[PDB]
Design an enzyme around this catalytic site. Structure first.
Site, PDB file in Angstrom:
ATOM      1  N   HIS A   1      47.718  23.153  35.490  1.00 43.60           N
ATOM      2  CA  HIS A   1      47.906  24.592  35.404  1.00 43.60           C
ATOM      3  C   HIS A   1      46.926  25.238  34.435  1.00 43.60           C
ATOM      4  O   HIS A   1      46.863  26.468  34.364  1.00 43.60           O
ATOM      5  CB  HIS A   1      49.369  24.968  35.136  1.00 43.60           C
ATOM      6  CG  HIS A   1      49.791  24.966  33.697  1.00 43.60           C
ATOM      7  ND1 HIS A   1      50.505  23.934  33.127  1.00 43.60           N
ATOM      8  CD2 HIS A   1      49.658  25.904  32.729  1.00 43.60           C
ATOM      9  CE1 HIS A   1      50.789  24.225  31.872  1.00 43.60           C
ATOM     10  NE2 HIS A   1      50.281  25.417  31.603  1.00 43.60           N
TER      11      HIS A   1
ATOM     12  N   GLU B   1      37.455  19.878  16.542  1.00 42.86           N
ATOM     13  CA  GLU B   1      37.915  21.145  15.995  1.00 42.86           C
ATOM     14  C   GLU B   1      39.075  20.964  15.033  1.00 42.86           C
ATOM     15  O   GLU B   1      39.976  20.154  15.276  1.00 42.86           O
ATOM     16  CB  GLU B   1      38.415  22.064  17.116  1.00 42.86           C
ATOM     17  CG  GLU B   1      37.340  22.654  17.973  1.00 42.86           C
ATOM     18  CD  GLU B   1      36.679  23.840  17.309  1.00 42.86           C
ATOM     19  OE1 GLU B   1      36.835  24.013  16.072  1.00 42.86           O
ATOM     20  OE2 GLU B   1      36.032  24.621  18.032  1.00 42.86           O
TER      21      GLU B   1
ATOM     22  N   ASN C   1      39.973  24.363  12.541  1.00 41.68           N
ATOM     23  CA  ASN C   1      40.125  25.805  12.685  1.00 41.68           C
ATOM     24  C   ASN C   1      39.295  26.233  13.896  1.00 41.68           C
ATOM     25  O   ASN C   1      38.063  26.152  13.864  1.00 41.68           O
ATOM     26  CB  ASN C   1      39.687  26.523  11.411  1.00 41.68           C
ATOM     27  CG  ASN C   1      40.032  27.992  11.442  1.00 41.68           C
ATOM     28  OD1 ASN C   1      39.894  28.658  12.468  1.00 41.68           O
ATOM     29  ND2 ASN C   1      40.530  28.501  10.329  1.00 41.68           N
TER      30      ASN C   1
ATOM     31  N   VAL D   1      36.567  29.037  13.214  1.00 42.24           N
ATOM     32  CA  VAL D   1      35.545  28.837  12.187  1.00 42.24           C
ATOM     33  C   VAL D   1      34.754  27.582  12.523  1.00 42.24           C
ATOM     34  O   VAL D   1      35.341  26.533  12.800  1.00 42.24           O
ATOM     35  CB  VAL D   1      36.182  28.696  10.790  1.00 42.24           C
ATOM     36  CG1 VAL D   1      35.120  28.486   9.699  1.00 42.24           C
ATOM     37  CG2 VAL D   1      37.057  29.912  10.490  1.00 42.24           C
TER      38      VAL D   1
ATOM     39  N   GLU E   1      32.179  19.989  14.931  1.00 44.42           N
ATOM     40  CA  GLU E   1      32.438  20.310  16.325  1.00 44.42           C
ATOM     41  C   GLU E   1      31.341  19.809  17.254  1.00 44.42           C
ATOM     42  O   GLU E   1      30.167  19.708  16.890  1.00 44.42           O
ATOM     43  CB  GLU E   1      32.526  21.825  16.506  1.00 44.42           C
ATOM     44  CG  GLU E   1      33.641  22.538  15.729  1.00 44.42           C
ATOM     45  CD  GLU E   1      33.267  22.978  14.319  1.00 44.42           C
ATOM     46  OE1 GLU E   1      32.206  22.572  13.766  1.00 44.42           O
ATOM     47  OE2 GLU E   1      34.060  23.772  13.766  1.00 44.42           O
TER      48      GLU E   1
ATOM     49  N   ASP F   1      51.436  17.903  37.152  1.00 43.87           N
ATOM     50  CA  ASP F   1      50.665  18.866  36.347  1.00 43.87           C
ATOM     51  C   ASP F   1      49.641  18.109  35.494  1.00 43.87           C
ATOM     52  O   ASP F   1      49.788  17.945  34.278  1.00 43.87           O
ATOM     53  CB  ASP F   1      51.598  19.716  35.492  1.00 43.87           C
ATOM     54  CG  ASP F   1      50.902  20.901  34.875  1.00 43.87           C
ATOM     55  OD1 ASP F   1      49.738  21.179  35.252  1.00 43.87           O
ATOM     56  OD2 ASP F   1      51.504  21.551  33.986  1.00 43.87           O
TER      57      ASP F   1
ATOM     58  N   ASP G   1      59.290  22.398  18.918  1.00 41.22           N
ATOM     59  CA  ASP G   1      58.879  22.333  20.320  1.00 41.22           C
ATOM     60  C   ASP G   1      57.399  22.667  20.419  1.00 41.22           C
ATOM     61  O   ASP G   1      56.802  23.196  19.475  1.00 41.22           O
ATOM     62  CB  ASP G   1      59.689  23.359  21.131  1.00 41.22           C
ATOM     63  CG  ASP G   1      59.698  23.107  22.634  1.00 41.22           C
ATOM     64  OD1 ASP G   1      59.156  22.102  23.146  1.00 41.22           O
ATOM     65  OD2 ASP G   1      60.316  23.952  23.326  1.00 41.22           O
ATOM     66  N   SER G   2      56.808  22.345  21.573  1.00 43.23           N
ATOM     67  CA  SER G   2      55.528  22.943  21.949  1.00 43.23           C
ATOM     68  C   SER G   2      55.768  24.350  22.513  1.00 43.23           C
ATOM     69  O   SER G   2      56.907  24.776  22.707  1.00 43.23           O
ATOM     70  CB  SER G   2      54.746  22.039  22.900  1.00 43.23           C
ATOM     71  OG  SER G   2      55.470  21.738  24.061  1.00 43.23           O
TER      72      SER G   2
ATOM     73  N   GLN H   1      53.534  28.202  24.307  1.00 41.81           N
ATOM     74  CA  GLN H   1      52.365  28.747  24.997  1.00 41.81           C
ATOM     75  C   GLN H   1      51.105  28.543  24.160  1.00 41.81           C
ATOM     76  O   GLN H   1      51.105  28.754  22.943  1.00 41.81           O
ATOM     77  CB  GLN H   1      52.542  30.246  25.266  1.00 41.81           C
ATOM     78  CG  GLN H   1      53.290  30.584  26.549  1.00 41.81           C
ATOM     79  CD  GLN H   1      54.762  30.267  26.469  1.00 41.81           C
ATOM     80  OE1 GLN H   1      55.380  30.381  25.405  1.00 41.81           O
ATOM     81  NE2 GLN H   1      55.347  29.874  27.598  1.00 41.81           N
ATOM     82  N   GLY H   2      50.031  28.110  24.818  1.00 41.85           N
ATOM     83  CA  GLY H   2      48.791  27.770  24.150  1.00 41.85           C
ATOM     84  C   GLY H   2      48.637  26.302  23.826  1.00 41.85           C
ATOM     85  O   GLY H   2      47.512  25.848  23.555  1.00 41.85           O
TER      86      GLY H   2
ATOM     87  N   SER I   1      49.643  24.049  26.134  1.00 36.66           N
ATOM     88  CA  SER I   1      49.587  23.398  27.437  1.00 36.66           C
ATOM     89  C   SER I   1      48.309  22.604  27.594  1.00 36.66           C
ATOM     90  O   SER I   1      47.225  23.037  27.175  1.00 36.66           O
ATOM     91  CB  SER I   1      49.674  24.421  28.569  1.00 36.66           C
ATOM     92  OG  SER I   1      50.996  24.889  28.707  1.00 36.66           O
TER      93      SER I   1
HETATM   94  N1  LIG Z   1      57.547  23.177  25.458  1.00 33.47           N
HETATM   95  C1  LIG Z   1      57.559  24.435  25.796  1.00 33.47           C
HETATM   96  N2  LIG Z   1      58.599  25.186  25.509  1.00 33.47           N
HETATM   97  C2  LIG Z   1      56.413  25.005  26.458  1.00 33.47           C
HETATM   98  C3  LIG Z   1      55.231  24.261  26.863  1.00 33.47           C
HETATM   99  C4  LIG Z   1      54.252  25.045  27.462  1.00 33.47           C
HETATM  100  S1  LIG Z   1      54.814  26.672  27.504  1.00 33.47           S
HETATM  101  C5  LIG Z   1      56.292  26.330  26.765  1.00 33.47           C
HETATM  102 CA   LIG Z   2      36.006  25.033  14.241  1.00 29.57          CA
END
Ligand SMILES: N=C(N)c1ccsc1
Ligand SMILES: [Ca+2]
Length: 223
Positions: A40, A52, A54, A57, A62, A84, A171-172, A174-175, A177
């Site tokens: 996705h 990486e 930061n 910066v 890098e 996925d 948890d993980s 958004q961003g 993924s």
């Molecule tokens: N683990 C989650 N809640 C999650 C993973 C990608 S978007 C939300």
């Molecule tokens: Ca950097």
């Protein structure tokens, strides 16, 4: 990553950032020429950023390398996120060093209860939005299949697993993924989806990499 901690610069040397003018997904370096991420996260014109900490910066370790090809899993279903997983080939081989290093693929699946390291540059808040710039880390256990399927009735396939904490708070998000779930030194998961972030009874859902090792190895060997 919600409820995690600052990893420390280059302490997760297989973690990559996928950049298309901005960071949009994580990935994992699996050899000098190949990255594995979430299907996705597919788009054209990806630049892979290695070494990486930061992401805003230039700190001196890098490597920025354009993708030459992307391969989405043949069975990826964008409606359900089943399968996925994608592979990204680098136009030139990364120079491997202590801060830019590959992560081994599983030789078998991992058990419920095994502790894993999940990492990324995604949102750190479970209500609202704050993006962290430096890499964040979370230690979290693989959850039982039954608790995973109970949390997401009708949505979990054999190509997914849950990890985290049913009480919420960690948890993980958004961003994150496409980024890694590493357990016992092996890439066992890819950050895939969830309901909100860090909510009670809604753990993170991850692509089950151990089901894909043969596909990964054969695809790389032929491309
Ligand atoms: N683990 C989650 N809640 C999650 C993973 C990608 S978007 C939300
Ligand atoms: Ca950097």
């Amino acid at each position: 990553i919600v409820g995690g901690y600052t990893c420390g610069a280059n302490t997760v040397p297989y973690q990559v950032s996928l950049n298309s003018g901005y960071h949009f997904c994580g990935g994992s370096l699996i050899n000098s020429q190949w990255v594995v991420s979430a299907a996705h996260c597919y788009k054209s014109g990806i630049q892979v950023r290695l070494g990486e900490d930061n992401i805003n910066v230039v700190e001196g370790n890098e490597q920025f390398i354009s993708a030459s090809k992307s391969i989405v899993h043949p069975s990826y279903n964008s409606n359900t996120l089943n399968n996925d997983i994608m592979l990204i080939k680098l136009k030139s081989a990364a120079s491997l060093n202590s801060r830019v290093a590959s992560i081994s693929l599983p030789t078998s699946c991992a058990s419920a209860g095994t502790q894993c390291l999940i990492s990324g540059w995604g949102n750190t808040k479970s209500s609202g939005t704050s993006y962290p710039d430096v890499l964040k880390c979370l230690k979290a256990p693989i959850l039982s299949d039954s608790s995973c399927k109970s949390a997401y009735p009708g949505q979990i396939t054999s190509n997914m697993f849950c990890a985290g904490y049913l009480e919420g708070g960690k948890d993980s998000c958004q961003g994150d993924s496409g980024g890694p779930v590493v357990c016992s030194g092996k890439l066992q998961g890819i950050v895939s989806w969830g309901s909100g972030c860090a909510q009670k009874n809604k753990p993170g859902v991850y692509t089950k990499v151990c089901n894909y090792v043969s596909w990964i190895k054969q695809t790389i060997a032929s491309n």
